Every structure is written in structure tokens, then in C-alpha cells.
Amino acid sequence: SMEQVAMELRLTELTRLLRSVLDQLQDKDPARIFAQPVSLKEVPDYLDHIKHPMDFATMRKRLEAQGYKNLHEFEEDFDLIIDNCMKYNARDTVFYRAAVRLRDQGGVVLRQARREVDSIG
Numbered sequence: 001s002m003e004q005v006a007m008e009l010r011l012t013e014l015t016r017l018l019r020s021v022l023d024q025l026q027d028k029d030p031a032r033i034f035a036q037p038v039s040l041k042e043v044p045d046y047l048d049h050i051k052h053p054m055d056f057a058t059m060r061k062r063l064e065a066q067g068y069k070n071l072h073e074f075e076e077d078f079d080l081i082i083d084n085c086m087k088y089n090a091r092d093t094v095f096y097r098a099a100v101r102l103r104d105q106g107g108v109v110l111r112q113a114r115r116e117v118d119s120i121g
Contacts, residue, residue, distance in 0.1 A: 014117070015066050018074055021113045022063060025078060026056050028105040033098045034081050038088075049088050058068035069116045075110060 029035065037055045038046050046053070059077045068074045082099045106110040 005095065010038055010121070011066050011069075013120070014070070015063060015068070016114060017113065017120070018068055018071070021074070021109060022056070022059060024109045025106050026107075028102050029056070031094075031098060033095060034085070034102065046088070050084045052080055052084070054084060056081070068091070071114060078106065078110070 026035070034056050036052070036057050037053060040046055054077050059074075059081075062068060062077070068077075079114075082103045085095055085099040089099075
């Protein structure tokens with residue numbers, strides 16, 4: 001149908017918007033602490049602590065498979081990156097501190113993307 005195509009045009013444009021958002025969020029992590037999954041070879045107990053691991057490479061695979069239906073699902077994944085880190089790592093670690101800074105700095109980007117997604121529909 002003509003409708004399913006118009007739908008697919010918007011999903012593709014949402015994917016296009018979310019890709020830009022993802023790049024902006026990931027620039028707030030210059031140390032690349034959140035770039036890749038936590039290694040289960042190097043942290044073998046990780047899944048006993050964190051039940052839904054997340055990282056920017058994993059979010060990027062989902063994004064390019066147009067696996068995000070709306071901004072809310074995307075934010076959920078971003079929030080996992082942050083909240084997992086803040087549980088697993090203690091307050092006085094470079095890791096916890098990197099998460100706080102990413103949360104704080106990402107807020108501004110996410111605030112405007114919400115306005116943009118409501119605005120462009």
C-alpha cells in the first residue's frame with residue numbers, strides 16, 4: 001500500500017533524527033566508557049548484577065535495523081546505559097562519574113529531540 005510506504009518514510013526519517021541524536025550523545029563520552037558492551041570475558045559475573053546490559057554499539061545496531069519505534073524506546077536504552085553503570089560501579093569511580101556527566105550533558109540533547117519529534121510529527 002501507499003500508506004505503509006508513507007509510514008516507512010517517517011520511520012526512516014525518525015531513524016535519521018535518532019542517528020543524529022545518538023551521535024550527539026556519544027560525543028558526550030569522549031573516553032568511550034559506554035561505546036561497547038561490558039566484556040563478559042573480563043567481568044564474568046556482570047549478568048548476576050545487571051539484567052539488561054546496554055551500550056552505544058548495541059543501540060546503533062538496533063537503530064540501523066529501524067528497531068526504534070519512537071523516541072521513548074530510544075531514551076529507555078540510553079537510560080539503561082547510565083543506570084546500569086551507576087549501580088555496578090561505586091560513587092567514587094571514573095565509571096560512575098562518567099555516567100553522571102553523560103546523563104547531565106545528554107539532557108539538553110534529549111530535551112530538544114523531544115520538541116523536534118513532536119514538531120515534525
